[PDB]
Amino acid sequence: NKFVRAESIVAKTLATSREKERIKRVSILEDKKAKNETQHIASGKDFILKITEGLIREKTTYDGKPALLFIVRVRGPLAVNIPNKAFKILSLLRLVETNTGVFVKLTKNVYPLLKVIAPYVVIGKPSLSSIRSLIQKRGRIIYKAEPHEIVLNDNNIVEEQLGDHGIICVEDIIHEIATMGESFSVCNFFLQPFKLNREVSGFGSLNRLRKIKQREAESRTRQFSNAATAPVIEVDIDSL
Amino acid sequence: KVPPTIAQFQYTLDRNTAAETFKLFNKYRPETAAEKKERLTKEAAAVAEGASPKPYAVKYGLNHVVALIENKKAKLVLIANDVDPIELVVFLPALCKKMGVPYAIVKGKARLGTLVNQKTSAVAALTEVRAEDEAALAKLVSTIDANFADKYDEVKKHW
Amino acid sequence: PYEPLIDWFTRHEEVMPLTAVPEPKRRFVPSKNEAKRVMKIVRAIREGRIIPPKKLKEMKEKEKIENYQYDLWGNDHVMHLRAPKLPPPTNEESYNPPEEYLLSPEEKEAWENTEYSERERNFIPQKYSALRKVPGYGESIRERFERSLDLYLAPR
Amino acid sequence: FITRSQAVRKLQVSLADFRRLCIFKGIYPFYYAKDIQYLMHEPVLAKFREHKTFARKLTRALGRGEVSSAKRLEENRDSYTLDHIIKERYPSFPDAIRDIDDALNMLFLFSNLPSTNQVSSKIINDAQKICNQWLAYVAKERLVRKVFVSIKGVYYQANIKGEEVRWLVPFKFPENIPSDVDFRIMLTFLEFYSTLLHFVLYKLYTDSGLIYPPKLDLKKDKIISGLSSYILESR
RNA sequence: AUGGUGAA
RNA sequence: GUUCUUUGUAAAGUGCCUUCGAAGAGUCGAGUUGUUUGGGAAUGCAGCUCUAAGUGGGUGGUUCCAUCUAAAGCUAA
RNA sequence: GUUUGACCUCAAAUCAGGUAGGAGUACCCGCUGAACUUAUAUCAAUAAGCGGAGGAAAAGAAACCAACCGGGAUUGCCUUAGUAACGCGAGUGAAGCGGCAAAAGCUCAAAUUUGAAAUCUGGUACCUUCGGUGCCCGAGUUGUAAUUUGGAGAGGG
């Protein structure tokens, strides 16, 4: 294959070491917090940061009430190879592919994982309209061996797949996902999470400039705190 | 064949050294016409309704660079290897060596012009650099010296 | 004839420069030409000649949105020009049609096997039990593309 | 007649640009020499030449390594307008109303089309906004007369000034985009129909004494975003 | 001599 | 004359004190072959082998001194 | 990257903005140029021919003239003078100084603006149009903007 230079190897090694140190510190702090040995730590209460357009920063604590969250892959940092600790979490959510997104239920046990995978993904709480549009625009149903991933097309297919829990149409799945329904976990796993199209999706004179501008804006909009008690960063997913 | 003074060029820096030098130079791109014009208009608008430090930029003018050399003010000098009037640049390497100013020969005058918002720049030199890049400037100077004076110590010999 | 050059003159580095040329104050002082240009721009702005960049931004923000804010009215009669014929109405493609329109499997097989763009119908009417059971239609894109092609590829 | 290659050479324009101009002007073929000669005077050709010059200049600037210059060039650039091309093709408003059938069909089809690489999400959002405006105007005027749910979709017929224009809307289910269709050709029609529908909607709102473009209900836009979320005010 | 014209 | 504008830490001139302080090369010149003058030091112009220095070089008379700074250009009477 | 873009070069456009042809020719500025006519000299650096502008043209402010108590752009007249000088026969033939007419000196190259290519051609919208401003593009850094030509000149107090 193509020759590999030393600069890239050194940069990747340093970035991976930094990421591993951050992950180890965050995991150790979270484990101690769960043990209730909060006598000597930087902070005990959880924090969630909301950033929106000019930019305004809002810091709010996290409560035990369940909430709906949407997570989209970001493919970052640039020179950071995904570590095993983050690799397992990504594989569990099958979000390895870029631009992929899925819906998860916000719980106390999920907050440490969200913090661990915070730099790699962008999270937020979408509105009902956004969820409905996303579900009705894209979808996948695995059909019979079953090597086919044909897009969702018929309501009767929904009846055939689940059937038992009254899920007979796409609107039933939309309600179960948006609302804290019993079948929220079951439907989400079978939903074959969406593969959102990339932003620029182009290359050329104008496309290169647009991509450069988008990358420049991404750095300002998204940041990697790298702190042990780094609050979870939330953006307006409805815009996407 | 060609005399020793000719063929002294074309013994440019290696890929890594040239890339590092251009990366360092790209941090001191002189403001283009539009940038300077907008800055001046903003200053005028501020003055209309009611102390910056010395600006840092790469000195590139052939006459300006030659004036900077022979006074020991310049620290690094980049020399194009494709100057059609070769006589304009034949004396630059020897003059720099006599003055002791570190110098290097880079491939293409258009490459020098690109980093100075010009179609073609005969030479590109640095006089003053920010304290942050002072260590980087010294490291680049040492690397250029090692890769040019010692590696190509025979550049001034063997016709 | 061919011998290496000798550094008799370049062997010793020049410790001292060539000419003193005492430095002018402008080198240690902010540029005066820039100040002159700034004063000229200030004079132009005062004389109502140059719009400040903030004023230009404010004016342009109001502008660029006044489009489609004027009535345009308030053509094929030429012998060598013909109007574009519109498509005919529907051909009984109801989601819940009478059982007669439900083509038999033998004729449905012939419809499927036949070539494309030379077919009586682009669809197979079906008897769906409920409205909610109506599926999607991914062939609408192809039909619209064909219509667009025919619009500009019609030798009238 | 003059061959297509001959006409392109006479116009010395790119094949894609020539097709765009032909679609905008409605030329059909092997084309008449007089029609092609007349088409050469359209300002759209000058706009395309300016676009090509800007593209080459921007490529030069980006290759040189000056992002600021490219950004400034892009900011100063302006897109061409189809406002005057509409009038010549449709001298009278009734002609535009009659021809609005294909425009509405294409706009409604593209509104439900998912975002892809070929078409940016901005175009889809604009088409959805145009469709919402049209639906709100139709509902306010109560011009819907015929409904026919079919495999293709629901065939609507709005009696705009008694012209009973028939339009089709596909279902909301996801659509698998085929590779056979070339979106480049469809994009020109999309833009032309978007401009035509913008002008027609403004004219209709002015006739009905309604302010255009109306805003959208934000609280509804977070729940039932669509036709209902687009509030309209008479004055 | 200089500058041109014609021509079994 | 009448006026409307002036503009800005903007420009110019003189004396004093300090530090610097850059001048035209296939060019002069020699050689050689033709032309020019009534010109004895063919100066001047024309082909070509050759081709220099910057307290230097050219033009002259006396063992030194006198004048100028060529190889770039404009200017009404 | 088996790939894109730049620098440089070479060509096309019935593209936009520009100019040379020729005539006239007494005077001017260069090339070229004979014989009659008289004992290399002489008609003669003339006649004719060729090329280039004007109302005048060239030249013009010393690498000058002078050996004096020194003069101080070029130009034309008188004078120097029918002298010096040449040919030593025939003949050819100047110039300094002196008086008069008129008098204006300047523009580049050469040493860094580098604390800011600050210069300018062209397109466009306006106005107070032999032009001015804003914007845009290009020329330029292989040098356009300030000052200086020894009579000096430049950076500072």
Swiss-Prot record, chain A:
Q: Write the record's keywords in alphabetical order, separated by commas.
A: Acetylation, Nucleus, Phosphoprotein, Ribosome biogenesis, RNA-binding
The UniProt similarity line reads: Belongs to the universal ribosomal protein uL30 family.
State any GO CC term: preribosome, large subunit precursor
- Phosphoserine sites (modified residues): S201
Q: Where is the signal peptide?
A: none
- The identity of this protein, by name, is Ribosome biogenesis protein RLP7
Q: What does this protein do?
A: Involved in the biogenesis of the 60S ribosomal subunit. May act as a specificity factor that binds precursor rRNAs and tethers the enzymes that carry out the early 5' to 3' exonucleolytic reactions that generate the mature rRNAs.
Quick check: keyword Acetylation in the entry?
A: yes
Gene name, per UniProt, is RLP7
**Which residues of the complete protein appear here?**
53 to 317 of 322
- Which organism does this sequence originate in? Saccharomyces cerevisiae (strain ATCC 204508 / S288c)
| GO biological process terms, semicolon-separated | exonucleolytic trimming to generate mature 5'-end of 5.8S rRNA from tricistronic rRNA transcript (SSU-rRNA, 5.8S rRNA, LSU-rRNA); maturation of LSU-rRNA from tricistronic rRNA transcript (SSU-rRNA, 5.8S rRNA, LSU-rRNA); ribosomal large subunit biogenesis
Instruction: Indicate the principal place this protein occupies in or around the cell.
Output: nucleus
Give additional notes from the record.
Present with 7720 molecules/cell in log phase SD medium.
Listed GO MF terms:
mRNA binding; RNA binding; rRNA primary transcript binding; structural constituent of ribosome
Compartment(s) where it occurs, according to its Swiss-Prot or TrEMBL record: Nucleus, Nucleolus
What superkingdom does the record give? Eukaryota
Q: Would the keyword Oxidoreductase be found if you checked this record's keyword annotation?
A: no
UniProtKB/Swiss-Prot annotation, chain B:
Cellular component (GO) terms are:
cytosol; cytosolic large ribosomal subunit
GO terms assigned for molecular function? RNA binding; structural constituent of ribosome
Q: Which UniProt keywords apply?
A: Cytoplasm, Ribonucleoprotein, Ribosomal protein
Q: Which GO terms describe its biological process?
A: cytoplasmic translation; maturation of LSU-rRNA
Keyword Repeat, does the record have it?
Answer: no
| Keyword Coiled coil assigned | no
Where's it found, cell-wise? Cytoplasm
Assembly and binders: Component of the large ribosomal subunit (LSU). Mature yeast ribosomes consist of a small (40S) and a large (60S) subunit. The 40S small subunit contains 1 molecule of ribosomal RNA (18S rRNA) and 33 different proteins (encoded by 57 genes). The large 60S subunit contains 3 rRNA molecules (25S, 5.8S and 5S rRNA) and 46 different proteins (encoded by 81 genes).
* Additional comment: Present with 238000 molecules/cell in log phase SD medium. There are 2 genes for eL8 in yeast.
Functionally, this protein is described as follows: Component of the ribosome, a large ribonucleoprotein complex responsible for the synthesis of proteins in the cell. The small ribosomal subunit (SSU) binds messenger RNAs (mRNAs) and translates the encoded message by selecting cognate aminoacyl-transfer RNA (tRNA) molecules. The large subunit (LSU) contains the ribosomal catalytic site termed the peptidyl transferase center (PTC), which catalyzes the formation of peptide bonds, thereby polymerizing the amino acids delivered by tRNAs into a polypeptide chain.
Q: Which family does it belong to?
A: Belongs to the eukaryotic ribosomal protein eL8 family.
Swiss-Prot record, chain C:
Report which superkingdom the organism of origin falls in: Eukaryota
Localized where? Answer: Nucleus, Nucleolus; Nucleus, Nucleoplasm
**Region described as Required for interaction with NOP7: spans on this chain:** 27-140
Which family does the similarity line name? Belongs to the WD repeat BOP1/ERB1 family.
Tell me, in a sentence or two, what this protein's role is.
Component of the NOP7 complex, which is required for maturation of the 25S and 5.8S ribosomal RNAs and formation of the 60S ribosome.
Q: What else is known?
A: Present with 2680 molecules/cell in log phase SD medium.
The record describes its quaternary structure and partners as: Component of the NOP7 complex, composed of ERB1, NOP7 and YTM1. The complex is held together by ERB1, which interacts with NOP7 via its N-terminal domain and with YTM1 via a high-affinity interaction between the seven-bladed beta-propeller domains of the 2 proteins. The NOP7 complex associates with the 66S pre-ribosome. Also interacts with NOG1.
Q: What is this protein called?
A: Ribosome biogenesis protein ERB1
Tell me the part of the parent protein that is shown.
Answer: 239 to 399 of 807
Curated annotation (Swiss-Prot), chain D:
Q: Which domain of life is it from?
A: Eukaryota
Induction info: Expression is down-regulated prior to the diauxic shift.
Q: Give the UniProt subcellular location, in the record's own words.
A: Nucleus, Nucleolus; Nucleus, Nucleoplasm
Phenotype upon loss of function: Essential gene. Reduced assembly of 60S ribosomes and accumulation of halfmer polyribosomes.
Miscellaneous comment as given in the Swiss-Prot or TrEMBL entry: Present with 4530 molecules/cell in log phase SD medium.
Q: What does this protein do?
A: Component of the NOP7 complex, which is required for maturation of the 25S and 5.8S ribosomal RNAs and formation of the 60S ribosome.
Question: Which family is it part of?
Answer: Belongs to the pescadillo family.
Subunit info here reads: Component of the NOP7 complex, composed of ERB1, NOP7 and YTM1. The complex is held together by ERB1, which interacts with NOP7 via its N-terminal domain and with YTM1 via a high-affinity interaction between the seven-bladed beta-propeller domains of the 2 proteins. The NOP7 complex associates with the 66S pre-ribosome. Also interacts with NOG1. May also associate with the origin recognition complex (ORC complex).
UniProt-recorded name of the protein: Pescadillo homolog
Which source organism?
Saccharomyces cerevisiae (strain ATCC 204508 / S288c)
Q: Which gene encodes it?
A: NOP7
Q: Which part of the full protein is shown?
A: 15 to 267 of 605
